[PDB]
Amino acid sequence: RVKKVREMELIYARAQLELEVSKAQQLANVEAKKFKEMTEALGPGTIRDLA
Amino acid sequence: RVKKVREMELIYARAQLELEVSKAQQLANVEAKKFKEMTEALGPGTIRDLA
Amino acid sequence: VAGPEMQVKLLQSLGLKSTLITDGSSPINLFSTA
Amino acid sequence: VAGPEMQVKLLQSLGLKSTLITDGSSPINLFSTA
């Protein structure tokens, strides 16, 4: 019993692992992309002089 | 009884270890990659002058 | 060496109070974002 | 040796108180992130 279920919930959280990664990866990608678009959109110095 | 059950929860804890690792590793990679993108997106010293 | 130490000056015074104050301002953040 | 020691100066015063104050501012953280 336990050997069977143990491999079930196992294989599951494994496919559900790369899913989480997929999510947090693409979202961190679109965030860094969106942010790279923000920074660029106003001067590389303009951000420094507003600082 | 307890020898078999022992090796059970054991093979499980070791498999669910590289699961822990695989998750904790991949996410610490998306952070570093997203961070390397964030840093690079504004002057290697824009961070320094803002500081 | 973050304390010089511181110184300042002045003177013055016072009291009470102190001074410075401031606080406020604004910042940056807011501004940045805005 | 970071206590000079411290010283300062001044003157002054015061009271009460012291001085410084501051607190505040801004920071860085926030600034850083933003």
Curated annotation (Swiss-Prot), chains A, B:
Its annotated compartments are: Cytoplasm; Nucleus
Q: Which residue ranges run through the membrane?
A: none
Modifications the protein undergoes after translation, according to the UniProt entry? Phosphorylated on Tyr residues after EGF stimulation. Dephosphorylated by PTPN11.
Q: How does it assemble?
A: The vault ribonucleoprotein particle is a huge (400 A x 670 A) cage structure of 12.9 MDa. It consists of a dimer of half-vaults, with each half-vault comprising 39 identical major vault protein (MVP) chains, PARP4 and one or more vault RNAs (vRNAs). Interacts with TEP1. Interacts with PTEN and activated MAPK1. The phosphorylated protein interacts with the SH2 domains of PTPN11 and SRC. Interacts with APEX1. May interact with ZNF540.
Q: What does the entry's free-text domain comment contain?
A: MVP 3 mediates interaction with PTEN. MVP 4 mediates interaction with PARP4.
Query: Which function does this protein serve?
Result: Required for normal vault structure. Vaults are multi-subunit structures that may act as scaffolds for proteins involved in signal transduction. Vaults may also play a role in nucleo-cytoplasmic transport. Down-regulates IFNG-mediated STAT1 signaling and subsequent activation of JAK. Down-regulates SRC activity and signaling through MAP kinases.
Q: What is this protein called?
A: Major vault protein
Covered residues, full protein: 761 to 811 of 861
